[PDB]
Each structure stands twice: as structure tokens, then as C-alpha cells.
Point group: D2
């Protein structure tokens, strides 16, 4: 029956931003399929005071069209909170506020189908046939994959017994963790430090042991200096994508400090808190680096975790009743892409050889990939501050026209000669 | 010549320009704006290097009334190809030259502005306000929105003073002359004076002049910018402040000076650090004096003879300076062109415009609207860029009868009235 | 046995005088403290609370950085100097500063704890100080350092119930958080710290939280560096020489210079209000320009009659908890009754403190720590000027200037 | 006359040793310095330049806060203590620290300025130190503190023209701004301060400003407090015990821990670029990943051959002015030639500095200040660990501890 211009699979910030940007475009009509009954953005990490790491301009539309009615500032105006935000004079919205803002934006759009899980994608008669778990079938000429990056746990914890959790479900399991006699957090990303700051603040009223163990060499901060922020730019992606595949993969091993790590102010608040608590006596906490969790066993409601200090070359074990795996996220190719696997391009490492224009299929403009492209677009791939730019390039290729102006240079420095 | 507009805006500063930007998509409103200068220009004499706004960029021409408006600072940055650079800069306060460039950019997009037009006479006839220009043109409108700003103020001691002294509003144009002199004296301790002092103190070793900073103020007090005090820049505080007695309001205007005047706290601290840095190499020939009012001045032998009095201590003293920079502020004066319609304007017991809560100054309560110059009725919000959109939205509401842009009634956590 | 001086009270100002006078052998002093050990406003030991002056304003440093009683040498001895080095924060925590003073007073032998002064007499060119236990000390000079007791409004004198002055907040916090409603009177630094503490857990206990003050705004502590130059020797020289009526009118105008709120705490309070208001309306009220004029206690509930002094309207507030954060005030200690004929007073009844911090007819017999805002402006209760004042006292007691006393420190001139 | 030790060189580390050993009567030391007086990188005395470590990292404070040679006591003597207190900045200006170090050296009795060491011999179980003037000193121990001389790329060895290393920038600034083009090579803190200085006057002189660096990014100095805990005694113990190949790999991947740009300075450079770009296109280039491989001089211009080592592309830059901010490197001094057999080397040819900072076969005869990143990681050139290493050196010299040597300062653990 009906054949749309494109189907959006998943409705996270990137595909929702595409939905807000394509809604006023008449000659371009797409639909978005989302498994959840409504938008929801990492609710398990809705800690008190938690905020974005990027300014409010990295919302769904502003960096492409500040006049769009779905901007964060327009959302604050409708809620009667714009003047209060003006006085707050903070660039970073709280996560619970950004999540409510996204739900508010998705509710203004009619191109979204909530409660719809894509289970099969087929290519028939020059059309992509999308089938959902409820049996509904959609057809279109292009696809925009925005399924995000699911949680990642070390394989040493796959099949582990007990009540251990990934950080993506921390808030729902907080009441149980604070009742235990010991808690161990694995990892040292931003989520680990937030949870560590959270549990360390109440370490007196509960009396547990708090262990923070990570494989990284240091609790390194997020490199947020402005000359480095210029690498989140179109001209750098131009230079980075043209590099040989071996150079891009070697860079990704050394560029994790540019988009991961801990907020510098959070590290300093954690030290200040440690200093404050230690005035009343020794604090029952441990912080270890260069230690990789290699195996874990459960018994009597207690975990025996085996680490190896890879730098020192020594093994040690830690016993703890609570286990929070703040081990990050990792993309895996969705199973619904199996019938069209022969139409998708791959690189010499088994991952999608994403084009400069964010395409992953043989035609070069049929299947578009949101996120999951660090090996081809560097730190800009999961960046909320580049979602409107990427959606601009996707709109430009889908439409042929540059509906939203796409900047070619933004940086004072040059990366290529 | 046969047209009757809904209103005529007199003067095109940031407040009336914001009204122009906000009424442009309103078809039921027919406005026209008359500006003396050939183009927009915003205190160009204070375009010192690095100088920036005291209010975040959301206090632009439209955003607090309509973030979706095409005349916002963010949309302007997007069009200039600078939006991502400002994103990385991560600074709420635009440069002054940047804000000026943005306002000229927005005025160029409108069709309702007549530049090079100086209003000389306003008359009332046939239930219409007749506005004559210096070129002889005549515009008729049902309403008026007055936005002529606040001209410079100099003390009575300097009226009819000889020499090359300057008010701070002409500093950038006279800077290359001032740095040649043997001594410079700054009078006043507002934000303008401190910016000039820092600029001249930064080059004190390159030019070898004495640098005097003398103020009538009791201290170099900072701009009170803490957030609970910022909540007084709100509509609910205006509701409270406006309905206070006239004597109470005039007393608060004398005491609320540190709320919207004074110096940025960061600038005061950077001044001290620079004094500390320069003092390492030897005595810095600079004087910082407070509680001292300039009572008399004369220009003889090519130099100035300033007579001060330390009002708190009660002792007179003199300062000799070849340069004189009066950073003594601005003050509104009733424009001459309103003379033929003073019978239709409402005044308080002090002789100033008894500006209504809805920003009207005429007898009907909705014919002549006043931008700025309303501190005695609207407190610190009167010259605040962060309340221009709010005032214009109330003005638009009185012109239409309907609230085109939503007008917030409460924004603050605290309460001011019981 | 007759000493050179007897110090009455052992707060930070007399303790600093103790550490500064220990190496001076030509001075014999003794200090009498009522309490068993040193304790500094322990009722305000809120979590994270810190000083409002940098650590260089400790007991000795601004007079002698080499003294062994410095905060830095204290940290060195506690194995915490390097951690403090990484902390890179000028402001010690309040519990830390209390522990530091306790560590310093207790390294000295000139302090007699558990000793309350009851009467002071002048008998043949000597000051004779008798204690509550009957013992008697004689000295040629006296150094009064008894501090400033809490102040409560007249509307609360003889008030029934369990209300507290903020100076006893830490002890009574467990019971206040049980109540259905809490009202804070005042808007100083103590009131805002308590408000921030109670607002942080307003969801946990679900009480209504009121913050009503007589101040016109929640004005911040004016802390910019050019204003800090008024905490200088040259400003006291200028301020003390002003006419007494000028000084008294100035004290009403310089409240924001030392009796406000830390600007960052004000901003933290607004952000917490903004944060909690996302979930729903926060049951809190913040009112200004309101004076507490009468209070009554009925069935564990307080009825507080307020008047908005600017608007001119009365209003009431019902609250089960009442925290008076209404500041402190110096009262003439009754043990000075026999020597009142030797003390100099001004036209308003307060001690006419000389520039050299003396309050007796000889200009060098009785010295007053603190309680001198009307003569020395904001420098009187300032920990940053405790070492300067003590070196001037030592200068009078010695005849020679032991510790170098700065004459000018500021870039600006206050006097012409 | 045979002393207990001879100090060779008088930089901050050996000057600190001199202040810490002055009150030790059981120790007889002497220090020999080539300069007529103390001078600390005066070629980098740009206006506003400050230390990157707090003032507690002075000559003595972290070992003995009571020492009369502390920065705070220097400020007291200069009548500048209160103004510094108002300044409330942890970082002294470089001109200030240089004046303070000169002040401390003039108070001491153990320094011979204008004395260059030309030879070191070992005979009769003593070290023989011969100066260029022919004077001969004997002592049981030696402490080497000759610093790290400038390093320039070998592509600039024997280069013609008026090019300079950044060590001499202030002396050549007047002539640099007259040229039509200036190129800075490298991206440490030195290069960034120079770029900011020249960019600030780019509208006054009309040169083109080039900033090219082999570094992959203009990375900031990692200064967050959990990383600062790696500058600690416990991290040195863990680090030194690691295998030698592991230590040499860490020195390559820890340049951002002490050899970056101050984060505030990066953001200021970007803001200045934003500001000046408002008026028009600013004539400046910033390039990374580019190594300088060849350089030749023509008339009064330089032709520089660069290679972007990542993109794999050669390019050239035409520049009249050349400023090499390429860092510093320790080379073994020639005066150690006769005693090389008594020194210990590792597999790479560098000194195998022990945990107690010794480099001689006896493990306690010759100590090395600085020049030990491969053995003590980022603490080796750090002013914040100068008093600690000097306290250990004094412990080895005196046989036991004189100043308290902390065993643990951090909250985290590095060894398991
Ligand atoms: C706690 C946290 C905070 C972060 N903060 C920031 C920040 O401040 N700035 C920044 O730049 N980055 C940030 N990131 C990184 C990144 O921007 C986010 O992870 C972001 O959510 C990624 O957007 P996405 O749409 O690609 O993924 P997601 O938000 O995970 O979108 C995936 C969506 O697709 C749906 N879906 C999945 N499979 C199917 C299917 N088969 N059919 C239909 N729907 C499906 C899912 O239900 C989900 O709604 C943060 C990440 C985390 C975890
Ligand atoms: C240097 C400086 C910086 C400031 N920065 C800020 C800030 O960051 N934030 C803030 O909130 N406030 C700020 N202010 C205060 C205030 O917002 C400004 O003074 C602002 O320019 C006032 O706008 P206005 O339109 O009322 O006056 P103006 O900008 O002065 O507008 C008056 C205009 O009307 C024209 N005009 C006058 N008479 C006539 C006539 N008869 N016919 C025709 N045209 C006429 C004039 O030519 C002029 O263009 C600043 C003030 C100064 C001086
Ligand atoms: C919570 C709080 C925090 C403050 N923080 C700062 C700050 O950071 N910086 C600053 O500059 N100022 C600060 N102040 C203000 C002021 O410096 C302090 O109040 C300071 O404690 C005053 O010192 P004092 O010795 O004069 O008074 P106190 O510290 O009160 O000393 C009085 C002492 O004398 C004893 N005493 C009283 N009567 C007798 C008697 N008859 N016989 C014997 N002993 C007696 C008392 O038991 C007590 O020990 C703060 C005040 C408060 C309340
Ligand atoms: N709005 C916000 O503030 C916010 C909040 C959360 C996340 N984010 C962003 O989301 C992204 C991910 O953040 P994240 O903190 O959730 O995850 P993350 O940054 O990827 O951190 C994962 C941590 O787990 C460690 N790890 C992995 N496997 C391990 C093993 N076997 N044993 C021990 N440690 C192991 C990793 O060490 P290695 O270093 O060796 O890999 C790493 O330290 C980042 O880009 C972040 O900026 C932002
Ligand atoms: N965006 C920006 O950065 C910026 C720049 C400039 C201005 N502004 C704002 O514009 C407004 C005016 O600023 P402004 O600094 O130009 O003026 P101002 O704040 O009014 O300062 C005037 C100074 O001159 C003093 N003075 C007046 N008459 C005197 C006399 N006879 N003798 C000695 N001193 C005398 C005044 O002392 P008294 O205190 O006794 O009156 C006062 O200190 C302010 O609200 C300001 O915030 C903002
Ligand atoms: N280490 C620290 O950070 C720290 C902590 C606490 C205190 N301090 C210092 O200790 C001193 C005292 O602090 P504080 O906050 O406890 O006292 P405070 O500064 O004197 O504040 C007292 C408050 O109570 C108000 N008040 C007085 N009588 C009232 C009445 N009848 N009705 C309503 N309100 C009334 C006052 O309003 P009015 O303005 O009208 O008088 C004032 O707002 C200050 O100098 C402070 O800087 C420092
Ligand atoms: N307190 C202060 O303000 C201050 C001031 C100056 C210095 N310092 C400290 O002194 C130490 C040295 O600082 P520094 O800035 O003088 O030097 P530096 O940190 O060692 O920086 C040297 C720069 O020159 C580059 N380089 C070397 N050879 C090159 C070549 N052939 N071609 C291109 N680039 C080349 C290096 O690239 P690579 O990255 O590949 O090596 C590096 O970027 C640091 O620890 C610093 O913290 C402190």
C-alpha cells in the first residue's frame, strides 16, 4: 500500500532529532518505530543532580535550525521555566529535564510509532521491508538505523549468579545496594564516578565498604579544553575519515580520553569528599587502577571477584556483596539486518565501513547509521553535539537539497595539509 | 502620506528594535520606527577590546518572548557560520561589538524602520498622534512607543568646562589622545569606569602617565549578581514594587544602585591582580580614591584643576591631570518634541513620568508607551536587556487586546508581597 | 605572683595571643577559659561547612609564618599536608579548624581550662581577677576575649517550646526533621547553611520549610578584592578617626561586608530549588523585609506574627519548628561591675575602644578582643585581623614592637 | 677542608636542599653555581606568567612549614603578605618566585656563585670537585643539581640566522615582532604562553603567526586531583619497582601528566581567537601531528620542512621568525667523565637512580636532583616533590630521618 521515504528504527536522541528536523519538510515523509511505549533516555542513570556533558545547544534541532519549535529553549518557554533557566545560568540541563524535554518533543510529532520492535528487514523490489514483532509491515526506499549501543559487560560476568547489575539499572537497585555490607564498582567512566560519588556521600549512614576498581591506567578526566573540542567538527571528520583504516583503529585506542572518562569537576568533588570524610576517621573505601576483572563467582549472597593488576603483573581477589558493572556500552549488529546483510558494506575488522555521508550499504545512500561509527567518524559519532549535523547530512542525501545549512569549517586550526 | 499606523516607535535602540522584531510577524499590527542614525549603533564609544554584555545572550531581542523567532542571537550565529564556534566558546556573554553586529543584522531584515529620521515635534489632533520629523515628514499613529534611551550625564561642576575632557561614551574615539598625556583622571566607579581603568592600567608602563581613579561612591562595590537577587528582575517583583508608595519607590531607587550598577566582580578582581602584578617591578603611579565628589573644575595652562571633597571625612583636596574622563553615567531627560502634548502625559509628585504598570505614560493608560527611563516605577528591570522582550510583550498585549506572546506572571521561587 | 596580663576567655583571638606570646620570654601571661577544652561554634558543624577566610588567617601566620602553631605546620604533623596540597582549597573545613585550634591550645602551658571569671577588681595599680572556684590572679593588664553570645529578638524572650538559636542547630537537628513544618528567622550565613541542609532532605521528611528574614534581600557577602582592602591597617586608622556618629551610621551600611551569605551558597540554594522543582512544587517559602514582632507556643505549634516592613502589611506563619538564626551581640560582662569607673564609654553606651584596642582610662590597661565594630569596623570579628590586633596588643605590653606591624597594605587611599 | 657534601648547581632543588640543611649543625655542605646569582628561566619571564604548582611547593614548606625560608615568610618580610592574602591565588608569578629564590639564597652561607664545576675525581674515598677558576673542593658525597639544558631538534643543529630556543624568548621579543612571519614549533606550556603573547599583538605588528607541533593534540596538563595523587611517595615506590621496560613505556605515555598546557591557558587562546576573528580573518595557522625534519636559512628567512606523521604528507612553511619551544633534555655533564665507573647505568644508557635518589655504586655517595623520569616518573622535575626528595637525601646523608618523610599521602592504591 503505502511506501514511505524512509523508516527510522529506534527513537533515541538521534532519530528523534531527525524526526523533529524532517517534520516541517513536506517533500520528505518518514516514519519512526520505537520499541518502548514512550521515549526514555537512560532512566537507570537518573541520579540526583545528574546533568548532560554537552551544553543545551546540543538539543534535537538547535545546531541545525535555532528557529525550530522543538528547541530546548522553546520547551522551557512552554513550561513556564525559561526565565528560571536564564537565572540558573548553567549550560548543562539535568538528565531528568532533558528526558522530559525529549518526551515533550516526541509527543508533538505524528510520525512516531511507539511500542513497535523491528524484528526483520528485507530488500524486495528496490524497497526495504521492515517487519515488527506484532506482524506489521512497513516499506520504504531508505532506512535510518538508530538503535543505540546496548550495555556491555565483561564475558567473565556472562551467566553470573546473584543480584549484580549494570549501571543502566542502578537507580532501581539503589535501595538494595545500600543495605549490603560491601559494594564494588567496576569501571571508571562518567557513570562509575557518579555512582561512586553517590554511594560515598551516604557511606556513614549505611556503613558498607565501597570499592572502585577499573582497568584504565588512571581516573583520567574528559579532555574538555576548547582547542580539543575543535576535533568535534566537520573538518576533522573529513580528515579522520580519509585516514587509512589501520590508522583510524589505532587512533580509537588512544582517543578514549576525548569522549569518555570522567568530568573534571566530578573527580575534584570526589577527592574533596574523600578529604572531608577522612577528618572523622579512616574511610572504608578502596580505589584501584590498572586492574582488569578476569572472573567472578557467587556464593552466600557474596561475590568473589578475581582481578589482575596488568601493569604490576599480579593477581588479587576482592570479596563484596554488591557488584555494579559500570563497564560501558558496545554496539552489536542487530539480528533484524541478517536478510539484508549482503547489501551492507563491512571493513577489514568486521564492522560497518560507514561512508562519509553516514551510509552503510552498497549504493552509498540507502541505509544510514546513527552512532556506532567511532572507527569512521571518531569522537563525533555518539556526540549529542553532532546529532543535528549528522541529521543534516542524512537529510541532504535523502532530499538532494541542503535544507539545513551544513557547515564545512568551524575550527581555527587545520587538521589536514 | 494618507496612512495611519497602529503605532510609531521613536528611536531604535535595543528595546524598540526588539519590539520591531516581535511585531514583524503580527499582521494585525502596523508599526513604523524612526531612528536618527543612518544605521543601528549601540554605545560604540565603549567598544573596548574584550568588552562583553552583562546579561547572557538569551537577553537578545526576541528569545525570552519567542525562542523560535528568526531574529534570535542563535539564529544570527547560525547564519554567519559561527554557531559551532560559539558552542565551543561556551560563554553566556556576547562581545559588545558582536551584539552590535547582531542588532544591525536584525534591523536590516525588517521593512518597518526609517533611518536618518529625527523626530522634532509630536502633536495630538483628530484622536491621533501626529509626529513630525526634522526633514518635514509627518507620520500619524493611534499610539506611540518612546525609546530614545538615556543620554550621557556630566556633573554640574563640568557644565561649560574648557579643554578636551570626555564623557566615557566617547572613550574609544579619544583613546589615542588620552594615552599621550602625562596624567589621566577617571571620575566615577561604574562598570564603564572600571573597564577604562583596566584598559589604561594595562599600558601604564608603555606610556608613563599617572592614572587616577576617583569616585563619589563609598566603595568599588560589585554588581550584585547572586541568583536570589536576580529573582528581583521578575514580573512579580514589578507587581510588588509598582504598587508601593511613591516615596518608598524613590527611596529604593537611591538604595538599589548596586543591583544594576557597579562593577562586575570578576573585573574588580582582575584589576587587583594587575595592580599586584605591576607592583612587583616598583611603585605604580596610580591612585584609587572613594567617598570623593568632584565639586569644581577648571582648564588652565592646558591642564585640569579638579577640586574634590572627601564627603565622609570632610576634607577637600585637589588633583592635577591633563586628561579627564567622566564616567559619570547616563540620565533621562524629557525630549523637547513632547512639548505640544505634555497635557496628555501623567507625572508624579517629583515631575517624572508616572509610568503605569503596563508601561504607559498617557492619560488613556494605553496611548503612549515608554521604554527605559522607568526605574522609579519598574526598578532595575527598566534598562535591563533581559526584560526588553517581557516589556515589549506587555506593550504588544495592550496594542492588540490579546496576549500574542505568553507573558509570565511568576518566575521566582521566593515571594515579595504578602 | 603578678603576671604581665591575664587573658579572659580562650576563643581564636586569645588563643592566637597565647601562641604569639609563648616565645616572648619578657611577657608572662595566663589565660582562663570556662570550658574544659577549646570548642568553636560546634553547634554549626554542618557537613562540608568551611571558613569564610583563607587558612593564612589562622592563629599566627599573618604575624609570623614561621610559628610552629600555623595551620600548615599542624597539617604537616597530622600527615595531611600533602592531601591538603592536592585539595587546593584556601578554606579549611570548620571541624578541621576546630581540631587545629584544639591542637594548638593544648601544646601550650599558659591556659587554665575549666575556669570562669566571676569578678574583676582594681586594687593598687593591679587588676585582680577572681574565679568561680575562688582562686585569684593578679596582673598589670587584662585582655578581654569573651566573644559575642547569641542574640534573639525581644519577641522570643521568655518563649515556651523547643525553639533554638542557630548556635545549637547540630544538636537539635534530629528532632527538627521530625516536625511537620520548620521556620528559619534570619538570612545570614548561618541561616543559609541551615536552609540548604534542610532543603536537601525536604523530600525525605516531607516538612514545609520557611525562610523569613528582615533583611531587604538575601544579599551576598561582598568579597571582591578592592572591598577586601578595607580589612587593612590604613582603613582602621581612617575609620577610627571618623566622628562617632559617622561610624555608627556606617555600621548600618557595612552589614553586607561581613554579615551576608557566601555568594556561591546563594547560587547553590537556587540551583537546588530549580532541581527539586522539576519533580513538583517544593513546599518552601522565602520571604524578605519581614520582622518577627511576636511569637506564642500552643500545643507544640508556634504562631509567628510577622510584618512586611516595606509593604506595610502584617502576616502570620504557623510552624512546629523554629530556628532563630538572628545573629550574635556583645553584652558587657557582669564581672566588670567593680571596674566600670575605669572603663571608657561613648555616647551610645558602648566601649570607646581606642585605636590600640584599649577600653580603660590609661590607654593600656584593659584590652578588648572583638566587640569593636563601632570603632574598628569589619576588622573587629575578622579572623584575618586577629594576628594584627594581637601584635598591636603585644606592642603595648612590651613597649617594643615584637612582630612587625604593617602600616599600609592596600593599593587605594581611604584618607586624604 | 673536607665537607660532608658538595652541591653542583643551584636551581630550585639544590637551593631547597641548602635551606633545609642550613639549620642542621651536624651537616657541612657547600653549593657551587655558575651564575652570579640565582636566576630561574628569566627568558620566559612573560608578563603575568606564574607557577603551575601552588606556593606550598616552595623551597621548604612541604618538609618544614616553620622554616624561615618559606614563601609566606618571604612575603611577610617584604610587607606583601596581606596583599597576597587578598590576592587569594595559589600560584606565585614567576618574577615573584625568582625574586623569592634570590632572597633565600642571599640569606645563606653555603653558596659560591660564579663558580663552574669542570671536573669530578674520586680518590682517597672522597670526591674531588675542581672549578674553572682552579679551586678544588673535597667531600664525602655529591648532590647533582645542574638541571636540564634546552633541547632543539637535530634538524636545527648548526642552523644559520637569528632563530632562538624559547629559553631566550624575552630577550628577542623586540626583534621578533618586527618580522613578517613567526613560527612556533612545539606545544608545551612554553609555546602556548608565547603564542598567546604574540597573538595578542597580532593587530599591532602585522605578522603571520604559525604554531606547528609534533604532538597529536594541544592536550592540556592532566591536573585533576585523582591524577595528582600519582605525585606521591607511594606511587614512586610502586613505579620504581616496576620492570625497566615498563617504566620506559610509562614515560612515553605520561607526557600529559606534567608536560602539557595549562587548561585555562588553552581556553584563553581560543577565546582570543574568537574575539579577534570578529573583526576579520586572523592570519594564524595551528597545526598538529607535524614533525620538523629539515630547516635551512636564506637571507633572513627560514624554509622549514615538516611532515604530518599521521596523514603521511610532507609540507613546507616559509617563516622569517623561528621560535623552538621544543623542550629540555638532560645530557650527562662532562665533569663526570673521570668518575663514570662509579656511576650506575641501565640498559638504555641513563642513570639507574635508586629509590633513595642515588646513582653511585655504593647507593649513597652521589645523589641526582631531577633527570629521573624513567625512575621516579612525573615527580622528578616537580617543584612539589623537591622538599620530599631533599628530605630523603638528608635521611641518607645523616643516616636517619631529620624531617618527617611521609610514607603515604594518597587515598587510592597503586600496588596490590
Ligand atoms: C547516561 C548517559 C549519558 C550520556 N550523556 C551524553 C551527553 O551529555 N552528551 C553526549 O553527546 N552523549 C551522551 N551520551 C552518549 C550518547 O549520546 C547516548 O548514549 C545516546 O542515548 C545515544 O543516542 P542513540 O539514539 O544512538 O541511542 P539510544 O538513546 O539508546 O536509542 C536507542 C533506541 O532505539 C530503541 N530500539 C532498539 N532496538 C530497537 C528495535 N529493534 N526496534 C525499535 N526500536 C528499537 C531503544 O528502545 C531506544 O529507545 C550519554 C550516554 C549515557 C549512557
Ligand atoms: C556600554 C553599555 C553597556 C550596557 N550593557 C548592558 C547589558 O549588557 N545588559 C543590560 O541589561 N543593559 C545594559 N546596558 C544598559 C541599557 O540596556 C543600554 O543603555 C541600552 O542601550 C538601552 O537601550 P535603549 O533603546 O533604551 O536606549 P538606546 O540604545 O540609547 O536607544 C536610543 C536610540 O534612539 C535614538 N533617538 C534618540 N532620540 C531620537 C529622536 N528624537 N528621533 C529619533 N531617534 C532618536 C538614538 O539615536 C538611539 O539610537 C548598557 C549600557 C551601556 C552604556
Ligand atoms: C559559625 C561561625 C563561623 C564563623 N566563621 C568565621 C570565619 O570563617 N572567619 C572570620 O573572620 N570570622 C568568623 N566568625 C566570626 C568570629 O570570628 C567568630 O565568632 C569567632 O569565634 C570570634 O572569636 P572570639 O574569641 O572573639 O569569640 P569566641 O570564639 O566565642 O570566644 C569566647 C570564649 O571565651 C569563653 N568565655 C566567655 N566568657 C568567659 C568567662 N567569663 N570566663 C572565661 N571564659 C569565658 C567562652 O567559653 C569561649 O570559649 C564566625 C562566627 C560563627 C558563629
Ligand atoms: N551526561 C553524562 O554526564 C554522561 C553519563 C554517562 C556516560 N556518558 C558518556 O557515555 C559514554 C560511556 O560512559 P560510561 O561511564 O557509561 O562507560 P565507559 O566510559 O566506556 O567506561 C567503561 C569503564 O569500564 C572499564 N572496563 C571495561 N572492561 C573492564 C574489565 N574487564 N575490568 C575492569 N574494567 C573494565 C573500562 O576500562 P578501560 O579504560 O581499560 O576500557 C572503563 O574504565 C561516554 O562517552 C560518556 O561521556 C555521559
Ligand atoms: N555590558 C557592560 O559591561 C556595561 C558597560 C557599561 C555600563 N553598563 C551598565 O550601564 C549602566 C551605567 O553604567 P556606567 O558605569 O556607565 O554609569 P554608573 O554606573 O552610573 O557610574 C557612575 C559613577 O559616577 C559617580 N559619580 C556621579 N557623579 C559624580 C560626581 N560629581 N563626582 C564623582 N563621582 C560621581 C557615581 O557615584 P555615585 O555612586 O555616588 O552615584 C558612579 O560611581 C549600568 O547599569 C551598567 O551595569 C554595562
Ligand atoms: N565560617 C562561616 O562561613 C560562617 C558561618 C556562620 C557565620 N559566619 C559569620 O558569623 C557572623 C554571624 O553570622 P549569622 O548568620 O549567624 O548572623 P547574622 O549575619 O547577623 O544574620 C542574622 C539575621 O537575622 C535577621 N534578624 C535579626 N533580627 C530579626 C528579627 N526581629 N526578625 C527577623 N529577622 C531578624 C537579620 O536581619 P537584618 O539584616 O535586618 O539585621 C539577619 O538577616 C557573620 O559575620 C558571619 O559571616 C561565618
Ligand atoms: N609553570 C609554567 O608556566 C611552565 C612553563 C614552561 C614549562 N613548564 C614545564 O617545563 C616542562 C617543559 O615544558 P616546555 O613547554 O618548555 O617543553 P615541552 O613540554 O617538552 O614541549 C615540547 C614540544 O615540542 C615538540 N617537539 C619536539 N621536537 C619537535 C620536532 N622536531 N618537531 C616538532 N615538534 C617537536 C614536542 O612534540 P612531542 O609532544 O611529540 O614531544 C612538544 O610538543 C614541562 O613540564 C612544563 O610543565 C612550566
Amino acid at each position: 500500500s503505502t511506501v514511505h521515504d524512509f523508516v527510522g528504527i529506534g527513537l533515541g536522541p538521534f532519530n528523534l532529532g531527525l524526526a523533529c528536523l524532517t517534520e516541517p519538510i513536506d517533500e520528505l515523509d518518514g516514519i519512526f518505530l520505537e520499541s518502548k511505549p514512550d521515549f526514555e533516555w537512560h532512566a537507570g542513570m537518573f541520579l540526583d543532580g545528574a546533568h548532560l556533558q554537552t551544553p543545551f545547544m546540543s538539543d534535537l534541532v538547535t545546531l541545525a535550525d535555532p528557529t525550530s519549535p522543538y528547541s530546548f529553549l522553546n520547551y522551557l518557554k512552554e513550561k513556564g521555566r525559561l526565565y528560571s533557566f536564564y537565572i540558573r545560568e548553567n549550560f548543562y540541563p539535568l538528565r531528568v529535564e532533558y528526558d522530559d524535554y525529549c518526551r515533550w518533543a516526541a509527543n508533538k510529532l505524528s510520525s512516531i510509532r511507539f511500542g513497535t520492535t523491528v524484528t526483520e528487514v528485507r530488500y524486495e523490489d528496490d524497497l526495504y521491508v521492515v517487519t515488527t514483532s506484532a506482524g506489521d509491515v512497513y516499506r520504504a526506499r531508505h532506512l535510518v538505523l538508530g538503535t543505540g549501543t546496548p550495555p556491555y559487560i565483561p564475558e567473565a560476568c556472562q551467566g553470573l549468579d546473584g543480584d549484580f547489575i549494570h549501571n543502566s539499572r542502578y537507580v532501581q537497585h539503589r535501595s538494595e545496594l545500600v543495605k549490603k555490607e560491601s559494594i564494588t564498582i567496576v569501571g571508571s567512566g562518567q557513570s562509575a564516578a557518579e555512582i561512586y560519588q553517590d554511594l560515598l556521600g551516604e557511606i556513614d549512614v549505611h556503613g558498607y565498604r565501597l570499592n572502585w576498581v577499573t582497568r584504565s591506567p588512571r581516573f583520567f578526566p574528559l579532555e574538555y579544553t576548547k582547542l580539543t573540542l575543535e576535533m568535534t567538527s566537520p573538518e576533522y571528520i573529513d580528515y579522520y575519515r580519509e585516514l587509512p583504516e589501520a590508522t583510524r583503529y589505532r587512533l580509537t585506542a588512544e582517543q578514549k580520553g576525548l569522549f569518555k572518562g570522567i568530568d573534571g569537576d566530578l573527580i575534584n568533588e570526589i577527592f574533596d569528599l574523600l578529604y572531608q570524610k577522612n577528618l572523622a576517621g579512616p574511610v572504608p573505601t578502596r580505589l584501584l587502577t590498572n586492574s582488569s576483572l578476569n572472573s567472578a563467582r557467587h556464593e552466600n549472597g557474596t561475590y568473589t571477584l578475581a582481578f589482575r593488576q596488568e601493569e604490576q603483573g599480579k593477581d588479587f581477589e576482592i570479596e563484596s556483596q554488591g557488584l555494579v558493572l559500570a563497564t560501558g556500552y558496545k554496539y552489536a549488529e542487530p539480528e533484524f539486518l541478517a536478510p539484508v546483510k549482503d547489501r551492507l558494506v563491512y571493513d577489514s575488522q568486521g564492522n560497518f565501513d560507514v561512508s562519509r555521508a553516514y551510509a552503510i550499504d552498497v549504493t552509498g545512500r540507502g541505509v544510514f547509521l546513527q552512532n556506532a561509527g567511532v572507527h569512521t567518524h571518531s569522537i563525533t559519532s555518539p556526540d549529542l553535539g553532532m546529532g543535528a549535523y549528522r541529521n543534516s547530512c542524512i537529510i541532504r542525501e535523502l532530499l538532494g537539497t541542503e535544507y539545513y545549512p551544513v557547515e564545512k569549517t568551524i575550527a581555527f586550526q587545520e587538521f589536514s595539509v
